[PDB]
Each structure stands twice: as structure tokens, then as C-alpha cells.
């Protein structure tokens with residue numbers, strides 16, 4: 446008996462009345478709430494979410510420019526071992542900023558890894574396929 | 578967050594050196610080993626398999642085609658779950674339970690290609 | 704070689720401002736607009752849609768009686784060779800009334816045949832799987 | 836009406852009695868027979884297959900043994916792969932080779948017994 450199966454799934458999210466789309470993901474088994482931002486490339490974590498994930502903020506090195514302001518400027522790049530939104534994605538790029546971030550952001554780099562990603566007016570539709 | 582998913586699967590079984598195909602199924606949550614018989618229609622269960630499944634052999638009524646009692650199996654899972662599947666239990670000795678065409682035909686895809694039996698299915702997921 | 708494939712698909716429909724869900728199907732190659740009615744069984748076609756599909760209303764025998772909101776109506780049973788809504792369904796039961804009907808109805812007998820059918824927060828979601 | 840669909844498919848190949856796996860692929864619409872070689876990375880095309888694909892053998896540049904690198908616009912094996920790396924050997928080649936670079940792109944790839952099983956999912 447050789448057995449193989451694929452899970453083909455969808456997640457549909459209705460636009461919030463505030464005009465944004467939000468999505469809950471499990472990042473290293475921890476539920477984190479993201480705002481979808483098509484202007485973001487990698488994930489942007491709030492300091493509070495980074496700490497929930499067990500990052501030591503004092504050890505991070507802040508080398509990744511994420512703002513055009515002088516002064517407060519660089520975020521610390523991180524890699525997220527596991528991000529589960531329907532399927533599991535591995536080693537996802539992110540950074541942690543400096544504390545002005547109200548809510549963590551999910552950007553195009555992760556979104557573009559879904560088989561399908563569409564924003565159609567008031568809906569966001571994600572289609573995926575995972576082995577097993 | 579609305580979420581939905583479908584499992585799309587395949588089961589591939591290599592022909593046994595004895596010339597037959599065998600498949601393990603979970604029938605009402607019990608693992609049962611079937612021999613595939615394309616000449617069979619419904620499932621033929623051995624008495625011992627029937628008893629594992631909780632059938633009381635003394636209550637079954639055994640008519641002809643030697644004699645068999647018709648039964649219905651609540652659940653047969655082979656990749657996906659099939660419900661209320663027809664079978665019978667014979668009073669004569671049956672060496673191994675038989676899986677026939679009535680169940681096999683229900684798969685989205687079913688092919689015997691020389692020495693392989695290939696079953697394709699799609700099931701909703703919870 | 705062995706090759707086998709399945710098309711796994713979804714249709715998502717937003718609730719009309721009038722409170723109903725509508726779906727366009729291709730019935731014997733002809734686009735028909737249906738209202739979804741979970742309180743219907745077989746398809747109910749308007750006289751005009753039946754005529755679009757080439758039914759001769761004078762040849763139909765109105766042998767059936769449906770118990771509606773307005774009570775008892777006469778109908779002629781029909782079979783629709785092909786109904787495509789994502790996948791193709793074959794020999795689908797329907798009937799045509801004598802005139803009580805503003806828009807054709809798609810009911811539970813067809814909707815139950817989809818792998819998935821869900822109505823959630825002003826959205827109707829149909830999931831299907833078709834061989835090849 | 837938002838509509839989306841995915842084609843989910845499998846290809847199963849029985850080991851040839853000669854010990855190898857062979858796979859037919861459509862390369863720029865042309866059916867080409869490949870031997871699977873887990874030791875290969877990119878595709879290796881014979882000169883004859885290259886010609887079937889309309890490559891002019893006199894224009895190829897044999898760089899780096901040397902081979903001539905090429906890019907295949909379309910390789911279909913169940914699903915379509917685009918701009919796949921290959922080369923044409925000058926040293927002889929009996930049968931074109933499909934290697935790990937292309938095989939790894941499949942959702943599932945398994946050599947089980949005397950079977951090779953490829954599972955894919957393609958957006959539509």
C-alpha cells in the first residue's frame with residue numbers, strides 16, 4: 446500500500462470595516478494577528494509579538510533599513526521557523542522594528558508563496574495545496 | 578476566517594506474487610484485509626471478520642446464491658470513507674474477505690494496470 | 704506511464720443586496736440565472752427559461768404537484784442533460800411550473816451533490832472535484 | 836462569482852526491466868523520452884532531441900567536458916514548468932536525461948519499489 450494525499454484548501458477573509466484585511470497565523474505554534482500589507486515584502490513583527498515568540502530583543506542586531514526617516518531606521522532581520530496559515534511555510538523572512546508598529550504585517554513575500562492569492566474588492570482569498 | 582479543504586488522494590497496490598491484489602480497509606473502525614475480486618459485486622466477509630465487527634452470527638438470516646446472510650456495513654474507509662456498503666456473510670468457509678466491484682466503482686478513479694491497482698479519490702476535510 | 708488528474712475548484716458568491724444568492728449556470732450549453740433556495744428540492748425552471756432550453760410547453764405533461772408558499776401548484780417534470788456550475792452535472796431533475804415563478808430556482812438536490820456547500824457571513828461557497 | 840481551480844495530479848512509472856525509469860515529457864509541444872537520472876541536475880538533451888526542438892546544432896556554443904547550455908521554454912510532465920535549464924552534450928548521449936533540478940520541483944517525488952511516483956498541483 447503506497448498512499449499519497451494532498452490537502453487543497455482555501456482561506457477567505459472579509460475586509461474589516463476599517464478598510465484592512467486581518468489574518469491569524471500560527472507562528473512557531475503561537476497565534477499571531479497580522480494585517481495584510483501589499484506594500485510590505487517580508488513580515489514585520491511588533492516588538493510584543495517578537496517577545497511572544499521568545500526573541501530576545503537585546504540580542505537582535507538592527508541592520509535592515511525599514512524607514513526613510515533619519516535616526517530610528519533599522520529593524521532586525523529574523524527568520525520564522527514555521528508560519529501556518531492553512532499550510533505550513535518554513536523559514537519565513539521577517540524583521541522586528543523598533544516599537545512604532547501597531548500590528549504585525551504580513552507582506553508579499555509570504556503571500557506570493559500561496560498557490561493562489563487574490564484580493565477582490567471586499568474579500569481576500571488564499572488558495573493552497575499541501576502534501577498530506 | 579472561513580477555511581475549507583479537500584483531500585485528494587491515491588492508493589497504489591502492487592500485485593501480490595500469488596497473482597492477487599490485497600487491500601487493508603477499516604470497516605466500522607476495524608482493520609480488515611480484503612482480497613480484491615473483480616468478479617464479486619458486494620463485499621464477502623469471513624465469519625471471523627463479521628464477529629470482529631460485532632455481528633451476531635446466530636441472528637443473521639442466511640438465504641441462497643452455499644447460503645449467505647446479507648449485511649450492511651456502516652463505514653468502509655479506504656483512503657476515503659464510504660457509507661452503508663452492501664456485503665454478505667456465508668455459512669461455508671471463506672479463506673479471506675472479498676472486496677468487489679460495487680465498492681471499487683465508487684472511487685473517482687480505479688485502474689488495474691498489469692501489476693498495479695490504482696485508486697484515486699477526493700474527500701471533504703473537517 | 705499512468706497519469707491521472709482531478710480539477711479541485713471553488714465558486715464564491717456574494718449575497719445580493721436583495722438578501723438572495725444568485726448563480727449563473729450553463730444548462731445544455733445555455734446560461735441560466737438561478738436563485739439559490741435551500742427550501743427547494745429539484746430545480747424549478749420558469750416557463751421562459753424552459754422555452755430558452757427548447758422545451759415545448761404544450762408537449763410537457765403537468766403531472767406533478769408542488770406544495771409552495773402560495774400552496775399547491777402544477778408542474779411538468781423534466782431532466783436536464785447537462786448543468787455546469789464549476790463542474791458538469793448530468794441528468795439533473797427539474798420541473799416547470801405554469802407561471803408562479805419570477806426566477807428559476809436551484810435547490811438542495813443539486814447543491815447536495817457538491818463536495819462542499821457553505822453559506823457564511825453573506826457568502827456562499829461551493830467546492831467541487833471533477834475527474835480530468 | 837469568484838472562481839478558482841487547481842488541477843491535482845499524479846504520474847506513476849514502473850521501472851523498466853533494464854533497471855531504469857523512463858518518462859515522456861512534452862518539451863515546447865514535442866514529446867521527448869527521458870531517462871530519469873538522480874545523479875543529473877539539469878536536463879541533458881541529445882543532439883537529435885535538440886534538433887527535434889528546432890535547435891540549430893551549428894549555433895550552439897559548447898562552453899565550460901564541454902556541453903552547450905540551453906533553456907527550454909516549456910516542459911510539461913503533468914504540469915507545465917517554464918524556462919528549464921538544460922544542456923546539449925557533444926560527448927555522445929544515448930537518451931536524454933531528466934535530473935533532480937526538475938524532479939524536485941514536484942509537490943511529491945518518490946521512488947518506492949520499482950515505482951516512481953510524481954504528484955503535482957497546478958493553478959488554473
Ligand SMILES: [Cl-]
Nearest residue numbers: 537538554555
Ligand atoms: Cl518569505
Ligand SMILES: [Cl-]
Nearest residue numbers: 562563564565
Ligand atoms: Cl490581488
Ligand SMILES: [Cl-]
Nearest residue numbers: 559560573574
Ligand atoms: Cl500552496
Ligand SMILES: [Cl-]
Nearest residue numbers: 604605606607
Ligand atoms: Cl470502534
Ligand SMILES: [Cl-]
Nearest residue numbers: 623624670671
Ligand atoms: Cl467464513
Ligand SMILES: [Cl-]
Nearest residue numbers: 662663679680
Ligand atoms: Cl456497495
Ligand SMILES: [Cl-]
Nearest residue numbers: 684685698699
Ligand atoms: Cl472519490
Ligand SMILES: [Cl-]
Nearest residue numbers: 718719720721
Ligand atoms: Cl447587489
Ligand SMILES: [Cl-]
Nearest residue numbers: 790791833834
Ligand atoms: Cl465534471
Ligand SMILES: [Cl-]
Nearest residue numbers: 795796812813
Ligand atoms: Cl438532482
Ligand SMILES: [Cl-]
Nearest residue numbers: 817818831832
Ligand atoms: Cl464535487
Ligand SMILES: [Cl-]
Nearest residue numbers: 941942955956
Ligand atoms: Cl507541484
Ligand code: NA
Nearest residue numbers: 667669670671
Ligand atoms: Na463464509
Ligand code: NA
Nearest residue numbers: 624625670671
Ligand atoms: Na469459519
Ligand code: NA
Nearest residue numbers: 924925927928
Ligand atoms: Na550529448
